[PDB]
Design an enzyme around this catalytic site. Structure first.
Site, mmCIF file in Angstrom:
data_model
loop_
_atom_site.group_PDB
_atom_site.id
_atom_site.type_symbol
_atom_site.label_atom_id
_atom_site.label_comp_id
_atom_site.label_asym_id
_atom_site.label_seq_id
_atom_site.Cartn_x
_atom_site.Cartn_y
_atom_site.Cartn_z
ATOM 1 N N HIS A 61 0.779 -1.198 0.000
ATOM 2 C CA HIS A 61 0.000 0.000 0.000
ATOM 3 C C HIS A 61 0.833 1.281 0.000
ATOM 4 O O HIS A 61 0.368 2.370 -0.264
ATOM 5 C CB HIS A 61 -1.095 0.027 1.128
ATOM 6 C CG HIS A 61 -0.684 -0.435 2.519
ATOM 7 N ND1 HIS A 61 -0.478 0.435 3.564
ATOM 8 C CD2 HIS A 61 -0.581 -1.685 3.057
ATOM 9 C CE1 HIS A 61 -0.200 -0.261 4.662
ATOM 10 N NE2 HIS A 61 -0.213 -1.542 4.369
ATOM 11 N N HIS A 91 6.429 7.162 5.622
ATOM 12 C CA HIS A 91 5.944 6.722 4.323
ATOM 13 C C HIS A 91 5.300 7.911 3.632
ATOM 14 O O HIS A 91 5.146 8.992 4.213
ATOM 15 C CB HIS A 91 4.916 5.605 4.495
ATOM 16 C CG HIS A 91 3.726 6.035 5.256
ATOM 17 N ND1 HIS A 91 3.636 5.929 6.630
ATOM 18 C CD2 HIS A 91 2.603 6.656 4.840
ATOM 19 C CE1 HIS A 91 2.471 6.427 7.021
ATOM 20 N NE2 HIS A 91 1.826 6.872 5.959
ATOM 21 N N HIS A 93 2.131 9.232 0.656
ATOM 22 C CA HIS A 93 0.950 9.023 -0.171
ATOM 23 C C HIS A 93 1.094 9.875 -1.388
ATOM 24 O O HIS A 93 1.632 10.994 -1.296
ATOM 25 C CB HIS A 93 -0.345 9.392 0.567
ATOM 26 C CG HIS A 93 -0.500 8.694 1.885
ATOM 27 N ND1 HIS A 93 -1.257 7.557 2.039
ATOM 28 C CD2 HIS A 93 0.062 8.932 3.093
ATOM 29 C CE1 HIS A 93 -1.181 7.136 3.289
ATOM 30 N NE2 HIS A 93 -0.379 7.949 3.960
ATOM 31 N N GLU A 103 -3.167 13.650 1.211
ATOM 32 C CA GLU A 103 -4.315 13.234 2.006
ATOM 33 C C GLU A 103 -4.982 14.445 2.636
ATOM 34 O O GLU A 103 -6.144 14.719 2.365
ATOM 35 C CB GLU A 103 -3.871 12.180 3.012
ATOM 36 C CG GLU A 103 -3.527 10.899 2.329
ATOM 37 C CD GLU A 103 -3.601 9.702 3.226
ATOM 38 O OE1 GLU A 103 -3.117 9.766 4.363
ATOM 39 O OE2 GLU A 103 -4.121 8.683 2.760
ATOM 40 N N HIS A 116 4.360 11.235 5.777
ATOM 41 C CA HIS A 116 3.938 10.998 7.157
ATOM 42 C C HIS A 116 5.065 10.365 7.918
ATOM 43 O O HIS A 116 5.471 9.235 7.644
ATOM 44 C CB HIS A 116 2.758 10.034 7.183
ATOM 45 C CG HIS A 116 1.514 10.647 6.663
ATOM 46 N ND1 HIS A 116 0.417 9.907 6.262
ATOM 47 C CD2 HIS A 116 1.216 11.940 6.425
ATOM 48 C CE1 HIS A 116 -0.516 10.738 5.821
ATOM 49 N NE2 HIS A 116 -0.064 11.976 5.936
ATOM 50 N N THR A 195 -4.781 6.968 8.656
ATOM 51 C CA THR A 195 -5.508 7.152 7.387
ATOM 52 C C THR A 195 -5.629 5.877 6.570
ATOM 53 O O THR A 195 -6.179 5.908 5.491
ATOM 54 C CB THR A 195 -4.902 8.243 6.513
ATOM 55 O OG1 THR A 195 -3.639 7.816 5.983
ATOM 56 C CG2 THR A 195 -4.739 9.548 7.300
HETATM 57 ZN ZN LIG Z 1 0.102 7.956 5.913
#
Ligand SMILES: [Zn+2]
Length: 246
Positions: A61, A91, A93, A103, A116, A195
């Site tokens: 992911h 990590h 997004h 996000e 994050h 999240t």
């Molecule tokens: Zn995250």
């Protein structure tokens, strides 16, 4: 089987994780004029000088850069936080093109990606115990915009080919996360959640106002692993976003 697709994406998560419709879900849109300046918020203390990175993992992911959190090395303190939070992983997004990927949004603006840095409260035993607590985690969120390259990101980008496949990891020692931070530590903060499933409501969010710039070439390398691994903004509900500035 959760993911980010039409059949298993964010709009489906509530079926397996009903807290998805809860009272303190993340991310949120940060409306800069409804955010409340709080004079009592302290400056953030980001102490990353003795960070010990260990490896980088493709978890299906995203990719996580994992740290030795067995003692105080890289920690976050001050700001809205009471006590010390140890860095366990970071990590990102990101999106399938430059106009989306973050996000959190700011006045509805989406950035190309969002970093994050995840930290857990050392009052608890370990990360696993911390996520069961409403003040268990602190996540430092940093927006990425596309322009000039971030030199301190290049080591991450260059290793990604070796973890293209879901589940694979690689040694990743001696990476310094100080190279991913913008100049200013001005921030917004609010109580929220992870999240990603299980979407636990255990996070104090600290989102920095100043984005970092990364190059098109850098983000394109994220995309060779997957794309659009962002949850959209969730309702603020009965919360207030507080600002360390203005
Ligand atoms: Zn995250």
């Amino acid at each position: 089987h959760w993911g980010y697709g039409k059949h298993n994406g964010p709009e489906h998560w509530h079926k397996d994780f009903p807290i998805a419709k809860g009272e303190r879900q993340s991310p949120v849109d940060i409306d800069t004029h409804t955010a409340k300046y709080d004079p009592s918020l302290k400056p953030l203390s980001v102490s990353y000088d003795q960070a010990t990175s260990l490896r980088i993992l493709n978890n299906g992911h995203a990719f996580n850069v994992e740290f030795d959190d067995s003692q105080d090395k890289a920690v976050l303190k001050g700001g809205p936080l009471d006590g010390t939070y140890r860095l366990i992983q970071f990590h990102f997004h990101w999106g399938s093109l430059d106009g989306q990927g973050s996000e959190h949004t700011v006045d509805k603006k989406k950035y190309a990606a969002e970093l994050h840095l995840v930290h857990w409260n050392t009052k608890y035993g370990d990360f696993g115990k911390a996520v069961q607590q409403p003040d268990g985690l602190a996540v430092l969120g940093i927006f990425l915009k596309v322009g000039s390259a971030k030199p301190g990101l290049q080591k991450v980008v260059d290793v990604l080919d070796s973890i293209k496949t879901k589940g694979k990891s690689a040694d990743f020692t001696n990476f310094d996360p100080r190279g991913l931070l913008p100049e200013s530590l001005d921030y917004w903060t609010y109580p929220g959640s992870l999240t990603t499933p299980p979407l636990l409501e255990c996070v104090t969010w600290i989102v920095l106002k100043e984005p970092i710039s990364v190059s098109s070439e850098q983000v394109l390398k994220f995309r060779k692993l997957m794309v659009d691994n962002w949850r959209p903004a969730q309702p603020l509900k009965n919360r207030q976003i507080k600002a360390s500035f203005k």
